[PDB]
Design a binder for this molecule. Structure first.
Ligand SMILES: [Mg+2]
Ligand SMILES: [Mg+2]
Lengths: 147, 147
């Protein structure tokens, strides 16, 4: 087992979209991940807006210092992703911890970028370029950042 | 299976403390519950402060229109419960829903009341009197209410 990470008591959580095959942009589907770059467990939901309501696309637990595949989708699904949200709470289990904010972040996804690999960016989290949205950055929820 | 409840799309969530045996106040332990009077699933944590840090006492999922036993404790544990918190997120699974707030509520518990049954109140949720703290009342998180 891996130990906790130095600096990981600062909450850093990202929503990342990655091609399954960055070499085949015409045919590839995409993957959505919750990336938990922190020493906390998360409970989360990932939702998409449809009218005045929201549909839950994924929910559950993310362990410390890991990522979770939320969804695999083709580009036809982009029409459902005009506005998405991530809500979460963070905790440790059996270790004292700082209290963290309860987080809700609504995002307008840059769907044009899914046709343009060069608009995705290099990251430490994947070998492929990724489209990465902050949910919590340096303990600060990314409210009203991508809307 | 029970259907969703009329009015239950309004989030109402309570933290309730109940004696195991209201007839034996000298000897009885107490039970802490999360009461989810709503049509939403919840992920939650229940934490207690110790110094500048917090200890997780319970976490998980609560189903719609139910309650969950968080902890059974004796009165010696009241010394750990000077300040507690509940954090949660609410969602539906497979049904469209309104987006709900991500909630964090810190409470100073009225530990004197645990020696005085008449200070607990009748409720629809238990046959015994209960000490009930609002976490979300009529969709409004109970921030800075019990501090
Ligand atoms: Mg890389
Ligand atoms: Mg009653």
């Amino acid at each position: 087992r891996q130990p906790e990470v130095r600096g990981g008591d600062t909450l850093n959580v990202f929503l990342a979209y990655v091609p399954e095959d960055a070499k085949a942009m015409m045919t590839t589907p995409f993957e959505a991940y919750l990336v938990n770059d922190s020493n906390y467990y998360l409970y989360y939901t990932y939702l998409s807006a449809e009218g005045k309501a929201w549909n839950n696309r994924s929910h559950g637990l993310v362990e410390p210092n890991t990522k979770l595949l939320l969804e695999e989708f083709t580009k036809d699904v982009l029409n459902e992703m005009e506005r998405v949200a991530v809500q979460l709470i963070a905790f440790k289990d059996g270790k004292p911890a700082a209290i963290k904010p309860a987080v809700s972040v609504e995002l307008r996804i840059d769907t044009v970028k899914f046709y343009k690999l060069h608009t995705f960016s290099a990251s430490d989290f994947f070998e492929e370029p990724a489209l990465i949205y902050d949910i919590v950055k340096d303990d600060v929820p990314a409210k009203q950042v991508y809307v």
